[PDB]
């Protein structure tokens, strides 16, 4: 079903945001696992999977709308080298992506692509959940100190 | 454990190959799905997942060896626009990757990184399985004709 | 609860669209069944049932909103005499109905009837699924030819 | 128990026929498998296993009768390069083997080796089943054409 | 996938080794069974089956590599007439085959056919197991004497 | 089956490395248990058992190859007096043993003892896992401090 | 709890006896296994494991009593080269160990280390069981002759 060209361009931009997040979260996860921080591996792995599911939704929607999914352009990763830096980078990436979601959701409403909007609102809800988790963890590092915080990550939860 | 720098370089080059294949296979899968070719969606999706698993193994091994996984550089995709083209493109990608694996496996032996070699041989076995499947499907297109071939993809197997 | 009069007019228009679709899909289903095309009977039967469920939702919502559901006016059916024509007629009907759904969803937002809107967005998502299936089937007829296409319908899936 | 020398010669001749068939059917099976013709691999594999069971019966009977089983001489295989040729070669081999079975069954009756005869009649019944299947398949190739025939082999039955 | 011509010649040579062993083990097994030496029938039958599985692997690999499996040219059997002579012949055949495996495994590495090498290493492990069993049984004949040794074979283990 | 003398000597050297590690890990485990560090008792106990399984494999392989396993010479243990010292000693012992494994693995290939090599590669994989664990724990002591680290060991995981 | 220095010296001597026995029984077991004498492998393996459990008890007790377990000094093994010599060597080792146990049990009583004494009396019971088994087997070799004795070891019991 022929979709709106700019809606497809927004879907591709959002897809690109997910592609960056998949890679950044997955590498973060495996860094935490190498360091023995099992709890952080588990959460960041599942966030990577979430972003993969989002990417799939965008790819499927773009194809339905007769557009061309762009998996070729990968944007900048910001990996980081210690736990706080890694989490802050993930939070900044989520916030940037949420701004883009909000813009796309408004635009899709304007051109009456309500099913693409609906999909994007569900994805935004997921991202806000990730934002909550990241903000909270960052606060916990400050409140308990890094040594206690790292100890709290060695066992699965 | 401090690994061999050139082994790490190979692992990153192979990881790069997997990152391309993940995306190419996944987009191909969803293109087949959109077209109603369920059988091809199913196989290509699982090939994409296989390559994700390979990428994980490389990431984990690089980190163990105290190197930096590179998920930033994505090489060229070649998507294609019809089934035969798509399958031929996946086949050429697999064969390029197998050349690289053979080189890496010889080198790892020469510096006595036998565990990285062992890992890579298992991956190469996986890749040769993918090559067999692709070669066989391409021959089937020719033997039964494209119309019959497409009809044979519409149901799951 | 007294609803907005023009919301109710929209719900009655959409109900009208569903009533035409119920009958057109049902007759198509039983025509496919008569012809021995079991798979098309099954899909088209279940699309008819989907539209019945949508009609029920409209009737209940109209009554809640203190309007009068109109099941008396039936619009034009376009049955068709061969498989491709029948599927094309269903696709045209779905696309006309989607246009009407988009206008209703917009209008309901403007008068703050957000629950009628939510209902309608779910229904639109359903109809876009039907659109995807019909488009895909029509393309399959072309790609594999009508003889192979009809062979592919004789068994249930 | 000392058997009749010419009965033993017949059993060795028939064993020889089975040894050729085991190898010819097995290679055919794996050729079909390589080509993605799963249904033909399955049938031809099980025909190979049937001939292995027949060879075992001959070897055991010869030993009981105090003769020397000959597994050293292997007769001519005729592999073939396409499906029809391969099936025709199997059919010719089966028909040559049936002729030999008929002569052996007659001869065993004449010297009152009724248990060897009973064994051979069971084996002949098996081979006539294989003949029926091969004849039927070859006729199906002609009736539906080779493209449809090959399409019909790609899934297991 | 086109393989290296000399790798395929090695695989055919090894296949040839397996074809001889299949027949020699199977006849030995049934000779033991005729003699009432159940335990030796059981072991030798299962060794024959192992070699059948090895032959299958070679056939499938050769076909993948676009070579022609040779099941036509059966090498010399050495059956033997008493238990010790039979086991010694089996051992000599295993040792000859192991020499050939070692040569092939080195060559496959040199031309970077690492998957054919991996397969052959697994088969070599199997053959060394057979060698261990044979060497051990031959020593047991001498340690307990042949009358006790034969006694020890009449019941299954 | 007579093996290569130098391979047997390598296998005995490697066996010697395992015998030291069995004792060192076992004593470390029970020291951790005495101290109430249950998590460290559990891991180091299971590492000792791993090395016992490795020693068994070497003893079995050496005997198959007609050599004499040497369990008489025990090398130097370095026990240590506090958790970090104990773990660093285990790490140094593992790294020393890995060097010896790599040398033996290359030599076994050179003389075509591919089964001994396969065995040793599996053992090396196990050793690299122990190395990862030890490295990681040592880094965790530094990251969370010794007091928190010790607190993290008192409960089983 | 601060133990008596001389009790700890005895525990270390007994531990040393166990370490010799672990290695001697284990190697004996695997020699028997190599020879196909499965019953002897099974018994001698489990005796090795018994002595491992004894060693563990001594190590734990020594640590409780604030002594230093000595796993560094390994005493003389006497392996031997045929079944009778191997069992006689095991028996002589057991008898030597029982003398030391008796001395230690008396001493521990005299200094009121009744829990160490209780532990040692249980271990002595175990050793007298091993002594019974060994004496009995040696008598059986003589009574039935070595050829029959060896025959009786080839199956598990
Ligand atoms: C660094 C790159 C990636 C890695 C390491 C990775 C890793 C994984 C892993 C470990 C799984 C679970 C597979 C299993 O254990 O069966 C998975 C599944 C999956 N992947 Fe990826 N992936 C990557 C990129 C992608 C991309 C680019 C996409 C497509 C946009 C994608 C889509 C999916 C989906 C949809 C699943 C199934 C998730 C589910 O269980 O619902 N992945 N991936
Ligand atoms: C090309 C050479 C041969 C190949 C590749 C072959 C292959 C096989 C395979 C793959 C199996 C099943 C193995 C399993 O998964 O358990 C099998 C079973 C068997 N083979 Fe063979 N075989 C060959 C020759 C022979 C010959 C010459 C004999 C007789 C002398 C024989 C006797 C048997 C028997 C009796 C069975 C068990 C059948 C049953 O399931 O009842 N095979 N063979
Ligand atoms: C030649 C040296 C040794 C060898 C080859 C050896 C071998 C083994 C093997 C194969 C097992 C069974 C592992 C499994 O599969 O679960 C085992 C268990 C065990 N070993 Fe050892 N071991 C050796 C020395 C020792 C020593 C020196 C100790 C303590 C000082 C020890 C303590 C134990 C214990 C406590 C178990 C568990 C027994 C149970 O099941 O209760 N071993 N050993």
From Swiss-Prot, chains A, B, C, D, E, F, G:
GO terms for molecular function: ferric iron binding; ferroxidase activity; heme binding; identical protein binding; iron ion binding; iron ion sequestering activity; oxidoreductase activity; protein homodimerization activity. Pfam families: Ferritin. One of its GO terms (biological process) is intracellular iron ion homeostasis. Its cofactor is heme b; Fe cation. Changing residue 125 to A: In strain: ECOR 30. Fe cation 3 binds at residues 46, 50. It comes from the Bacteria. Iron oxidation is inhibited by Zn(2+), which binds at the ferroxidase center with a higher affinity that Fe(2+). The occupation of the ferroxidase center by Zn(2+) also severely restricts the ability of BFR to form an iron core. Disulfide bonds: none annotated. Keywords: Heme, Iron, Iron storage, Metal-binding, Oxidoreductase. Belongs to the bacterioferritin family. This is Bacterioferritin. It comes from Escherichia coli (strain K12). The gene is bfr.
């Amino acid at each position: 079903m022929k979709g709106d060209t700019k809606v497809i361009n927004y879907l591709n931009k959002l897809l690109g945001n997910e592609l960056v997040a998949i890679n950044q979260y997955f590498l973060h996860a495996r860094m935490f696992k190498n360091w023995g921080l099992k709890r952080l591996n588990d959460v960041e792995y599942h966030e990577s999977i979430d972003e993969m599911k989002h990417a799939d939704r965008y790819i499927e929607r773009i194809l339905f709308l007769e557009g061309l999914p762009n998996l070729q352009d990968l944007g900048k990763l910001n990996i980081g080298e210690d736990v706080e830096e890694m989490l802050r980078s993930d939070l900044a990436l989520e916030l940037d992506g949420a701004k883009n979601l909000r813009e796309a959701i408004g635009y899709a409403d304007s051109v009456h692509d309500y099913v693409s909007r609906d999909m994007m609102i569900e994805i935004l809800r997921d991202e806000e959940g990730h934002i909550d988790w990241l903000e909270t963890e960052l606060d916990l590092i400050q409140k308990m100190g890094l040594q206690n915080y790292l100890q709290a990550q060695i066992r699965e939860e």
